[PDB]
Every structure is written in structure tokens, then in C-alpha cells.
């Protein structure tokens, strides 16, 4: 723990400075190695060194003065929920409003002044203008505006000045938690130290040594020298604890040299012991570096108050007082109020602003002197006060009169920072490397057999292999986007400091990743190029590798620009998906350049992958001769042939050749001419450089039912095994609760405050409880956990349901079944009134940022347990934890009211202020380890407990000390307590224990279907809720529908009426191939909803018995399907017709059946997508691991689909996979239903031509072949000089080669339905095994 620059820090700093001086070897008030050295002088001299550079105007120290400060904000107009149907009109009205006044006053006129070195604390209730004031005085005026009369002067330099020249000397920190988790503390501080050394004014020590020493000192001063090698961490990453983490921010901003500061919500979620240390460290900064700071805090302990110089009290956006810290209480007592005996000064100052907690001075009322009682009157009285007449003088007397290190080093140090990040989180990088190695080794094998021959039968596979290689190279980098969004908040923080250019951060992010790219592009490419058996020449292999490197760089730098514009990955999934489809579809292989329609050619002319693939193929085919495989006239009857009487079944063939010159094949099919070898590299570099610079530019510039059971427990014991076998956490605890009483349960950092609720509430999961808990003198049973409420300490609700819906849902599912839905509603009205929330019953629960504020959410969570008509206790857990004083008192009053009505309550409590304590009728206090110390009436003013403890030997209590902490100091439980005896034994022997035991003995003479609803009703209600939750989530549904209506329509139109030529049939097959790649975006969009609702269920709904898991999972299934079916129907309508399938359907006369079945497949595919996305998340904690697994399975299924490589060419092993994947059946059925039963039309360049033998027509020459094989047609039969031949007479002969059939469409449909069903069933089973206890 920390003591505020005690002798230890001085010793450590002297040691470090001695080390610095010794290492430098190549007045005595300053020298490490002399006598009477003083650390403060040394640290202050380093500070001045950092500040007073000869050629910098940076001021020595900044105060602040402000008179008539006035802030107003945009009007709070009415709002409404953004249902899926409302978001269009809402978008329209908002856009019109922005394209083409109404305001409100937030801060009424204020004055003030703050001097170098002082500390200012801005007190006030929530929503009283604290944040607005803090932002105003630091010139961060965004979201509002300052009135014209305002005037601010930072000790000489107007507000506009520091915006132009000294930003960095004025800081604002809404929160001190933003830190990059995976570095160590030293690695977090030393980089900032390096960035800030005045590089031109150090002598006799190298740059790095001075930076290391400055970081070491900056750790030592703020008591962090024991976390030198721990990760800073976050909520989910283990590291330094909360207080230490918040002190890291002060150390960082100390090195950064900010002279003025502001901290808005500084001490969130810090106990009284840690907030004090944080404030003390801030005081040390103000003491040493001569800064000045202002902190706005809630629950300011008296100890933390004594350190502050000045206090600013706010109310309803006014100013009540602003003067020295210790004179505030006297001024407020002279005002007319009286501070109760035990109330702390800060709580007193805050409470006076709340009508209910005040205590007027009766003497003044009796004599008839006006006492202000509303904030306006208080402001008037203050303005009339002499304190203001002094403050105006102290104001007027002040109001009457770029990056340290050059750009290259800003890049260098950030690059090293990124390398450290990688080294501390190396598992993420090895995942990528191993994944790409595995993908290469797998998808290479798939080609391993066919390629060996090298004949003209592998041309299509030589195309597909390049397709896979170029895609899996280009898109292997996108995993780096996560580390961009992770590091954006920290870069935004460091921008506020004049620390480094954002361009520098981006430039370092580009470079730091290069090693991973040039490891993957070597391993993957070597493996793949070896396996697929391309040309062995090294002089072409190196060019292939170069082209892949350029492709990966190009796409990496394009998607960095895409990820820069959008706020978060959730935003980027849609536009990134659309751009990915555009770039991967127009690569020049799915649709060859010859067949691209006019309206989309330009897309091919601006696609870098198109040119790179062109270069790859020109390289791979140019100037190499492939021997033939099969000539078009075949069979024994053709045993005699002249060279000119035969040709190859391939595009570029020439009659009389023993081979085909690959140059001619690429010319014939794709129109790539060998003179275009380097165009691809040239354009690739242009795109890389251009999009890199665009990336940099963008980053630079952008009534209640009574209780009836006297619940009591005796001899209760608790034991666990995890840390050690058979150790005891509750040791013979005993007590009771009587209806109509409010009992509290306090304990130290030791005793199980919580564990004694969970053992009682039957909510523990492990261990053994000994002894008996009794209800009416007989043990609890299976029915118990439905008769007790339990208000979690947290507040977690479905963010789309409104308060009345949240209440009524639980009312329905928890209350007994025999009450009609009419009565439960009047009971919900009872509950709404008794909690006094009738004004906002119809608000949206939302999240903390935009919705119900914390007090309202805690009122709600209590509401949800009353509405279940529990008959036994209503347990709570630390209801006041996290709440400021005023809302804590409000909740305490609510609990007292519920207790008065007749509802028993047993509530844990943590650090309650002295005023709250009186409200709890009883108490149960426990020591380190579950030993009970006290159990009895708390008495009036806590006298009864103080009497007991003082009677048995405890040191007396001060007349104004807080009892709730006094007793914590009486017996252990406090740092350095040293209790004078064991208070467990005194209780064991006391009279009170005898009375309690006698009562329980008399208590044992007092004695004289695990889910309320069925499964069907639970599923009905939960499904209705989940429907309301998809609805009211416009983002999900619309980013689903527009994504589909683009991807499908784009794919449909690019192949608009592809025809029925051989290339046409291949293009239609690929079109059915790109129909499916929409799997991943839709699955990833769907996943978060399930995660949200499952997290709510397993946390709150499961233990409380609200509904059974079966009903939850069936709600998921029964709701996700009706949306996917609609999406599939839309996709069918926009996809089936443009590409021309219906025209094929009419010819065969089967339009109705071939349309209905196609629609059924377009529905089944989306239902399958939903089911697969449910299965993969059934057994995963996180959405991202589920997305990873789903993408991997989809890639594996799609690669072996029999379309990228036909199953004949597949190696022997992988045949099994080609049979078990579902997409093979899907493609076989859909393509067949598309293009079956129609005649083929070979084009002008497809047709094979040659000469017939002399003295016979073409028909007679060819006819025997047209019997040895049973398909093909001749454009002419009476020709004599030459003929033209087309191997395929009907598409039903092409499909058979693709291994699809039109007679097997319904069977494939049946198998696909079977796969959907299996996915759902296995999802349910894996949920039952991986999550249900």
C-alpha cells in the first residue's frame, strides 16, 4: 500500500539517482552521492529540465480563473424506440434536420480561481453539472457552448491560446482505466518516457538510459516499483489491481508534463482504502511537479477531504459555495443548517442539496430569519455572501493580466511498443501461423493427384489453384484489424496529450505487422507451390511469391482504410463483406474477362486482384507446351488419321498439334496477352502506396403480500476444498429474521458477507453445508428457492424491454399459475406505486449510457423480486455498493418502506455511512473467517451495539466517529488493527449469546413442481420476449436484409443471363458457388444476440427458477427461423430471375416445380446458416471463438464441394469429406434445378474445327464417333472443306460431368433438411452438456 512520498520513496529515488550518476561515468542539495541529499529537489529538477527548454514557450505553471462561466446545451427533445420499421423515418427526419434555436441552460453563471499546486474537488449530486464544469474549465468544449459573457484565463494565456499552442498543458480524463492490457507497467511507462525526453538537452548519458531512469523514478514516486513486470491488464486480463491501475495513469500523465488537469469520475469502483491512496498520489504530484488538478468524486471520505484545498459545491447547475476546503462547513452552518454529529464534511456538503436529508437549525427558524431552501435562493445567498466579495477580488487580480521528438523517433518507439505487445501475447500470432500452415497443407493435398500428369486435362485446375492461392494470400492479414480497434482508444488518449502524431501510430501499425506477413507468405506459399506442382523454375517461383506479397499488402492496406472509417468491427462487417465479395468475385476467374458484361467492366478495371491474377496466369502458362490428353475424334474406327483430321478438346488448340501452346489458351479464354506480364505488379504497387497514404491521412484527420415464516438458522457451518481440502469459511454462525424487520449483515475483508447469503439462499454450487437451516422449525425443501427473492448486486436486464414489460414478464412466469393475467397486472401496479416509479414505467431499460440511470436500475432490480410475491425473505446483496451518498440513502429509505409494509429483508452492506446505520433494525457482524461477533438490535444511534462492545473491553468510541468503521477497528479487519483480544470468544461467553441460543431453542417450538409454469407457457412467453428483442434491434435486422439484398443481387446481375455456352455453364456453376459465401457474415451477425440473451439467462434467470433451459433454447430455435425464411425468399426473388434460370425452366415446361424447389432451397440454406450459427455457439463462452470455428468448418465444407475440384480429380483420401459435407448436396441440387433439360450453344471460339478425310462429308466422317459416344452436334453436315464441332448436345450431359443430376433434386433436398435437423439437435445436446449444471 501507499503512504504518499514517505521515507521509502526518498530512499529509492536516491538509490536510482546514484545509479544514474555512476552509469554516467565514462550542489549537495541535489547530488545523489553527497550528504543531506533531498529527493524532492532532484525530481523537481528533472521536471524543470523536461519543461524549460531554451526554444520552447511552454509555460512554467498554469493556474486558472473564470468568471461568469455559462454553458448551454442542445434541447432534450422527445425520443422513441427505434423499432425495425421506425428506423427509416427516423433516419429521414434526422438527415433532414442535420441538412436543414432550441437549447437549454446547463450551468448558470459561475466564478472561481485555482492556483498552481492546489487541489479542487467538485462536489454535487449526479447530473448537477460536474462533468460540464470540468470540461469547460479545461477548454474541451464539445457537445455544448459557452455563453458570450464567459471569460477564462490560464494565468495569462486565453482559452484560444492553449488550443493552438499548448494543448497538453490542459488535460481532461473522463476515466483513468484506458490502458493497453498486454504490456507491463514498465513497458507502458518507459515508452512514454522515451517519447518525452528533450532530445537536444541531455549530456553524458545516452538517450535510453535517461529514459529508463525517468520511468523508474516516475514509478517510485507513485508507489508502483513493485509492479515493474506485471501486465497492466483489464477486467478480463489479470494484472495490477484497480488502484494500482489508476495510479499508472497518473504516473503516465506526470511524465507527459501536463501542468493543469481534470479527473471527472476518478474513483469509480474503489473502496475507501484505495480512493484515498489515489487522491494522495495526485496530491504528491501537485506537491512535487507543481501542477494543479480538479477531481470530481462521489463518497468522499473525511480522510480524503482533508487533503483538498478548495471545494466547489453544485446544485441543479448552480454554484452554492467555492472557497477554502475547511471553511465550507462553517459557512453552511451559518447558512441555517446543522451538521449531525457523525456525518462527514463531504456528505454534509452534498446532502444539504437534497430536501429529504436536510436538518434545519431550529433556532434560526424560531427567530423568523429566512433560510434558503431551493438552489436558486442558495445561489442568491452565496452571491450576497462576503466569501463571494473575497472570491471576486481573487479572480479579478488574475483576470486583469510541438511534439518533443522528431517524427522518426515517434515512429520508432511506437514500433518497439507494438513489438512488445506481440511478444507478450504471442499465442495470437502462433494461432495465425499454425492456421495458415494447416490450410496450405490441407488445400494443397486436394490438388495433389490431378496436377502430377501435367496434360491438357488440368487447365481448369491450374486456374482454380491460382484462385485459391491468390485469395488465401490476400485475405490472410485481416486478423490484424482486431489490434487496430483495441489500440484506438489509447491512441485517442495520447492525441489529447501533445505526445505524437496519429499518423505516427498508424505508420508504426503498418510496419509492426510486416514480420508476420513475411513469415506467412513464405510458409504458406512454399507448401502450396510445392504440393500443387506448378512450374519448378525458380525464376518464375520468385515472381509468383512477389505477386502474392503484393496482393497481401494491397488488401491489408485497403481494409485498414475500411476499418479506420467505422467506429467498431460490428460496423465494418457489412461494408467489408460487400467489398470482399466485389473483389473476390471479379478476380477474373469466376467471370472471365471475355464474359464480363458492359455495365460492370469498370469494376474489373479497378480491382487490383484482377491484374495480379492476370500476371500469375501469364507467368504460369506463357511459353510452355502442354501435351494433349484426348482428341475429339476417338475410337477404334479412327485408327488411321492424318495430322489435320483431329484437334484437342481445349480452347487454344490447333489441328495437327501434339500439344497446345498455353499462351494460346490464356489468349482464348481470358484474353491475357503475354506483353502484360508486369502490368499487374505495377498497378499493385500503385494501389499499395495510394491506399497506405489514404490510411495515414484518414488516421491523421479522423398492498404487498406479507411474510409468514420466521426464517432462522443454527450451528450453520461451511467448508470448501478448492484452495485447500476441508477448510471452514463459516464457523457456527447462528441467527434469525422476523417478518417486518430490516436486518443487515456486515463483515470485514475476511468474513463471508456474501457466503452467508449464498449458503442461506441455497445458491452455492460447491462444498458441503453442515447444520440445519429451518423455516418454521422444520428444514427447507425443494420448494424453498421459489419463495425467496434475491436482488443481485449487479443490474442486468434485457436492454430492449421496458420497465412495465420487465415487471410483468417475471410476474407471469414466477407467480403461481392459478391467478388470472388480470390480477397479476393489478399487483404489478401495486409494485410500481410502492416503488414510486410510475412516471417512467414505460421507459426502455437500455444501458447505463442511454437509458435508466443507476438508481433507477437498482430500484428496478428490487421491483422484479417483489412482483414474484415471495413469502419468505427478500435477500439483497450490497444494494448501496457503487451508489453515492444520496442515492444510497434513497435506496435505504425504499428498503425501510418495504420492511414496514411487512416484507422481511436480509441485506448485505459494505461500508455504510453513519447516517445509514441507524436505519437497520438489527445486525450480524463477523470476523476474519466466518466467526460471529455481534448479533442484536442496532439500537437508536447505534447505542446498543456500542454499549455491548464497550462493556466487554473495547476502547471507547469518539463522540463523532463512524460506528460502522469504529467496530471494524475494534476487532481486527483493519490494516494494522492489532485487536486487544479475540472477540469471538467474548461473544461465545457473553450474555447475548445465551439469550440468542435460548430464543432459538424457543424457536424450535414454533412449528405448530420446481417450476411454476409448464414448459409450453414458458416457451410462449420467452419467445414473445425474444421476438420483441429482434424487433427493436433495427441494426441486426437491417444489416441482415441489406447485406442479403446486395450480395445476392450483385451476384445475380453480374451473370445476368449467362447463356448456355460451355463457359456459360461453368459461370453459372460458379454463380451458385458464390451464392453461399454469405454464410459467414450472417452467422457472425446472428451470434451476438444469442450471447446477450444467454448471458442474461445463465446469470439471473437460471438460479431464480424463472424458466427451464428447454424453454430458453426452444425460444431461440423457434424465433430465429421465421426471419431466415423471409430472408431466403427475398434472396430467391432477386437471385433466381436476373441470372436467367427461369428462362431455362420455361423451355422444359417445368417452370412451377423448378421455381418452387429453388425457392425451397433458397429458404433452407438460410435456415441452415442459422442452425449452424446456433450449434457453434451452443458450447462457447465467447462469440469470436464461435465465429472462428464456424468459418473454419464452412471453409472446409466449401473447398471440398466438388466445384473447385471435381470428385474424380480429388485424392483417394478426401472422398469421404466430399460425401459428408452438406454444400455438395446443396450445389448439386441447385445447379441441376437451374440448368437442366436444355440444349447447349457452343460459341464461335469454343467450337473445334478441322478437316475431313478426302472424298467424304463431315457427317459421314464424324457419325461413328457420335455412336461410340452418345452426345455432340455438328453445326454443318454438307461442308467439305472444314467442320465445327461441339462436344455437348444438352446441358444434361454437362451436369453429369459436374456430377450433378436433375433426377436427384428432391433426394438432395431431403438430405439438406436432415442436416438442418441434425445441427439443431446437436446444438441442444451440446448446450445441455457444456452449460447446464
Residue numbers in the entry: 31 to 56, 92 to 165, 170 to 470, 496 to 796, 861 to 1166, 1178 to 1502
Task: Copy text verbatim from the article accompanying this structure deposition.
Pdr5, a member of the extensive ABC transporter superfamily, is representative of a clinically relevant subgroup involved in pleiotropic drug resistance. Pdr5 and its homologues drive drug efflux through uncoupled hydrolysis of nucleotides, enabling organisms such as baker’s yeast and pathogenic fungi to survive in the presence of chemically diverse antifungal agents. Here, we present the molecular structure of Pdr5 solved with single particle cryo-EM, revealing details of an ATP-driven conformational cycle, which mechanically drives drug translocation through an amphipathic channel, and a clamping switch within a conserved linker loop that acts as a nucleotide sensor.
In the apo-Pdr5, the arch of the LD2 connecting the TMD1 and NBD2 is not as well defined in the map, and the short helix H17 could not be resolved. This could indicate that ATP binding in the degenerated site has a stabilising effect on that part of the LD, possibly through the contact of E804 with the ribose, as well as an electrostatic interaction of the Q801 side-chain with the triphosphate (at least in ADP-Pdr5). In the apo-Pdr5 structure, the residues of the conserved MQKGEIL motif cannot be discerned in the density, indicating that the motif plays a structural role, perhaps ensuring that the linker domain becomes more conformationally rigid when a nucleotide is bound in NBS1.
